[PDB]
Structures are given as structure tokens and as C-alpha cells.
Amino acid sequence: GLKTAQKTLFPLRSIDDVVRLFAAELGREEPDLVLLSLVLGFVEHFLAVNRVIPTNVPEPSPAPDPPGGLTYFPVADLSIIAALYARFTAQIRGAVDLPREGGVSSRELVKKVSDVIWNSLSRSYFKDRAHIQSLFSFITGTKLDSSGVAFAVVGACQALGLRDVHLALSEDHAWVVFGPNGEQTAEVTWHGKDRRGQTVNAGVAERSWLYLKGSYMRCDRKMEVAFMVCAINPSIDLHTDSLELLQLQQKLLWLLYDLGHLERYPMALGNLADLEELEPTPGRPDPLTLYHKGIASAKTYYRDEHIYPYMYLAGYHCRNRNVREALQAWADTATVIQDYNYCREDEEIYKEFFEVANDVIPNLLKEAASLLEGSALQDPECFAHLLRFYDGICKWEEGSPTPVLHVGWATFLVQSLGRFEGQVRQKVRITFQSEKMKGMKELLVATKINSSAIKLQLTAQS
Numbered sequence: 255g256l257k258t259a260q261k262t263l264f265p266l267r268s269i270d271d272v273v274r275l276f277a278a279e280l281g282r283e284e285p286d287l288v289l290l291s292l293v294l295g296f297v298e299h300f301l302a303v304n305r306v307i308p309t310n311v312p313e314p315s316p317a318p319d320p321p322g323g324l325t326y327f328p329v330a331d332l333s334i335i336a337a338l339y340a341r342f343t344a345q346i347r348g349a350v351d352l353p354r355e356g357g358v359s360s361r362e363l364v365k366k367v368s369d370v371i372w373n374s375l376s377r378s379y380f381k382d383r384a385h386i387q388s389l390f391s392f393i394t395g396t397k398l399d400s401s402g403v404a405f406a407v408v409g410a411c412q413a414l415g416l417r418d419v420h421l422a423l424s425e426d427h428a429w430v431v432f433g434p435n436g437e438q439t440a441e442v443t444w445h446g447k448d449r450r451g452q453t454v455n456a457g458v459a460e461r462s463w464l465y466l467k468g469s470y471m472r473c474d475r476k477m478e479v480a481f482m483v484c485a486i487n488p489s490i491d492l493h494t495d496s497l498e499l500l501q502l503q504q505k506l507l508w509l510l511y512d513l514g515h516l517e518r519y520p521m522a523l524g525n526l527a528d529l530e531e532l533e534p535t536p537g538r539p540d541p542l543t544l545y546h547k548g549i550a551s552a553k554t555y556y557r558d559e560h561i562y563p564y565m566y567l568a569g570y571h572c573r574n575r576n577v578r579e580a581l582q583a584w585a586d587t588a589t590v591i592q593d594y595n596y597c598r599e600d601e602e603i604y605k606e607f608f609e610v611a612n613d614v615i616p617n618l619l620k621e622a623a624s625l626l627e628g629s630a631l632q633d634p635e636c637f638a639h640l641l642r643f644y645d646g647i648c649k650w651e652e653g654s655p656t657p658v659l660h661v662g663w664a665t666f667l668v669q670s671l672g673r674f675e676g677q678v679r680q681k682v683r684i685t686f687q688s689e690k691m692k693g694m695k696e697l698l699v700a701t702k703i704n705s706s707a708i709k710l711q712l713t714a715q716s
């Protein structure tokens with residue numbers, strides 16, 4: 255049952271209409287997670303899933319076709335959004351047996367709301383596909399990706415008036431927290447390419463990156479809106495994004511930023527900065543300000559145990575040919591990961607470190623050498639930052655149940671070391687933390703790089 259004020263905004267015919275509807279909803283003490291997620295899913299379906307008009311642009315009279323191409327919007331009728339809203343609420347309300355004396359919900363209650371979402375999904379589909387994140391995908395396709403399940407469970411709880419069930423976010427996983435002050439936890443979805451019903455205590459005690467040693471985000475309803483905005487997927491295919499969905503996500507994040515709802519959301523600040531890098535909004539903070547905001551947010555609220563705030567910043571410096579600053583920010587990234595244990599389900603962050611060490615840094619140093627042929631390659635500080643990055647990775651691996659470094663890592667390490675002349679490398683005096691890097695300190699600074707020896711040393715088991 256949509257309140258009358260919710261009804262007046264429709265029909266949404268523009269991006270701003272969506273923004274006004276988000277603006278209107280964020281003013282309430284509890285914004286409608288189902289209504290908001292349906293609208294974004296409807297908009298994204300007809301902009302990215304079912305692309306109505308092609309995206310290509312043609313090469314004294316007017317041109318026969320729009321010479322720059324076309325953007326469009328699928329009008330969201332009240333009748334159509336409300337019909338879908340009614341389907342979900344009729345589904346959820348008839349499925350759970352509603353005392354909750356303290357405004358808190360039982361573990362067995364959260365479990366059957368979770369079970370109602372879980373058992374509504376198709377048994378076979380590709381969990382990693384795009385555009386199955388929203389309640390629109392749930393109700394019209396019975397398909398949800400991993401964190402989409404957790405979000406749907408949270409939206410179902412708001413539908414049943416369980417103000418105490420909230421979305422919990424690590425950097426790669428989602429679950430629910432509940433109880434008098436968010437102290438119980440329950441897994442509600444799978445992770446990886448499931449532990450449903452269990453707490454996350456074991457994973458927090460595991461010191462795996464997946465559970466951030468307990469320094470994860472406990473969302474309020476306002477950050478749960480920020481999550482579904484971050485979850486907007488503009489990809490039409492791998493080489494094509496929808497300009498409309500990028501613009502919508504960007505204006506929505508600015509709306510959330512102005513209301514203060516990204517203050518505890520480092521990844522969302524980083525997402526906004528990345529959008530701002532491609533499409534600056536006049537009068538707004540530049541991307542670097544926003545990257546440093548996300549880092550300050552991670553330091554303030556999650557005691558500096560997040561990884562992505564630093565790779566956001568490092569990526570921006572890399573794309574802008576700021577070699578010193580990019581190397582320093584990847585060193586700081588490795589400095590956070592070195593206090594984690596590399597565990598079974600941490601493959602996402604491994605993949606990102608792999609790409610940095612074995613693609614991004616090699617490319618950055620090659621770029622710098624083309625200028626050389628002052629410069630970063632002549633700066634011992636830059637070499638020290640490179641070694642600090644590898645030292646953190648080795649410390650991360652040390653004592654973990656999963657190996658990190660393999661022979662391919664050694665190949666790129668030897669290459670990156672070679673980018674610094676021996677006279678530069680011999681100026682550093684470094685204290686390493688990892689046993690692996692200590693066991694080749696002298697081999698890293700020698701005038702002649704011993705590739706086989708460094709390869710042997712980088713690949714010794716932890």
C-alpha cells in the first residue's frame with residue numbers, strides 16, 4: 255500500500271523524477287526499500303537489459319539520423335510499479351507468520367524471511383550475471399545475485415515492519431544484523447563462485463578479508479538506499495555502458511552525499527569520485543577530494559581496515575600519470591592487507607592485487623620509462639614504495655592457509671625491479687616485515703638482478 259505522497263510523484267518520466275522520488279523517500283524516517291529498488295530495476299531493465307534503440311553513432315541538409323545518437327528514458331507508470339509492488343508485498347506478507355516485544359526480531363524469524371526469499375529463486379541460473387540485483391529482478395525473473403539476496407531479505411523485513419533487521423556489508427559480501435543494537439548476525443546468501451543460518455563469528459575470528467575482522471558496515475536505512483544506488487549496473491555489454499544509468503547513479507550519489515548518507519560509506523565515495531573523473535559536475539569537489547574522503551571515512555569508522563579506499567586513489571593517480579603518488583597508495587594498500595590472513599573466499603581482493611602487481615604497476619613503470627628515454631624511476635622513494643607493496647603481500651601470505659605468490663608474480667617483480675637502475679636501487683635502506691622479503695633484501699638492490707634467485711625466493715612456501 256503506497257501512501258498518497260508516494261503516489262503523487264508518478265509517472266516518473268525523467269532521471270530527475272527518480273531523484274525527486276529518492277529525495278522524497280530519504281526524508282521519511284524509513285524510506286521504502288522495495289519501491290525504490292523496483293524503480294531502479296525497471297529503469298535499468300529497459301535501459302540495459304532490453305536496449306530499445308542501438309547505441310552506435312553514425313560516421314547542407316540535416317542528417318537522416320540523429321548524428322550523435324540517442325539517449326532515452328522508459329516512463330515508469332504508477333500502474334506498473336504499483337502492480338509489481340503489490341506482487342512482492344502480497345508474496346512476503348502471506349508467507350511469514352507474524353510478538354517481537356522489544357521491537358527486536360528473533361533469529362528464527364529472520365531465518366524464515368530469509369527462507370522465503372531463498373526458496374523463491376530459480377534453481378539454476380548464472381549467479382554472476384548483470385542486472386539481477388534488484389527487487390525488479392526478484393519479482394519478474396525470480397533471480398538475484400549474491401548480495402541481491404541479502405538486500406531482498408532486508409526489504410522484506412521492512413515490509414513486515416522489522417525495523418531492527420539491517421544490511422551488513424563487507425567489501426565483497428553481505429548478510430544481516432539484528433537485535434537490540436545490531437549485535438546478532440545471520441548469513442542469508444552464498445558467497446563465491448553457502449553458510450546460511452550461521453553467524454559470521456567464525457569469519458571475523460578467521461581474520462579473513464571477507465569479514466574485515468569485524469570492521470564491516472552496519473547499514474541504517476539510509477545507507478541501504480546508498481547500496482542499491484551503488485548496485486545500479488549501467489553495462490549494456492562489456493564494451494558499452496548506458497549513459498543514462500551512469501548519469502542516474504551519479505546524480506543519486508550526489509543527492510545521498512548532500513544529505514550526509516555517504517559519510518560512513520567509503521566505497522560509495524570512491525564510486526562517486528570515479529564517476530566524477532569521467533563527467534565532472536561544476537561546483538563539486540574534484541575526484542581527489544572524494545578519494546581522500548573515502549580513506550578518511552575508512553580510518554574514522556572502520557579503523558583503517560578497508561582495502562578499496564587506497565586502490566580507488568591509486569587507480570586515479572595511475573591513470574593521471576602520477577607515478578610517485580600511485581606507488582605510494584599501492585604501498586599503503588599492501589600495508590592494510592598485511593594484517594589479514596589470506597583465506598578461502600578472499601579471491602576477489604587477490605584478483606585485484608594480482609592485476610596491480612602483474613599488469614598495472616608494470617604498465618605504469620613502462621609509461622614512466624618512455625618519458626625517461628624529475629622522473630619516478632630515478633627516485634629511490636619510488637623503488638622503496640614498490641618494495642613496500644611486495645613486502646605487504648608477502649606478510650599477508652605469511653602464516654595464511656592459502657598461498658599467494660606464484661611463479662608468474664616473480665616474473666613481473668623481476669621486470670619492475672629492472673625499471674630502476676642499480677644506482678637508484680642501491681640508495682635505499684629499508685626494514686622489511688615479511689620473512690620472504692628479508693630473505694632477499696640484498697638481492698633486490700644488487701647491481702645485477704638475479705632473476706632465478708628472486709624467482710626461487712618469491713615462490714618459497716609461506
Ligand SMILES: CCN(C(=O)c1cc(F)ccc1Oc1nncnc1N1CC2(CCN(CC3(C)CC3)CC2)C1)C(C)C
Nearest residue numbers: 401423424425426427428484485521522562565566569606
Ligand atoms: C559492484 C556491485 N556490488 C558488489 O560487488 C558488492 C556486494 C557485497 F555483498 C558487499 C560489497 C560490494 O561492493 C560494493 N558495495 N557498495 C558500493 N560499491 C561496491 N563496489 C565497488 C567495487 C569495489 C572497488 N572496485 C573498484 C576498485 C578496485 C578501484 C577500487 C570496483 C568494485 C565493489 C554492490 C554495489 C552490489
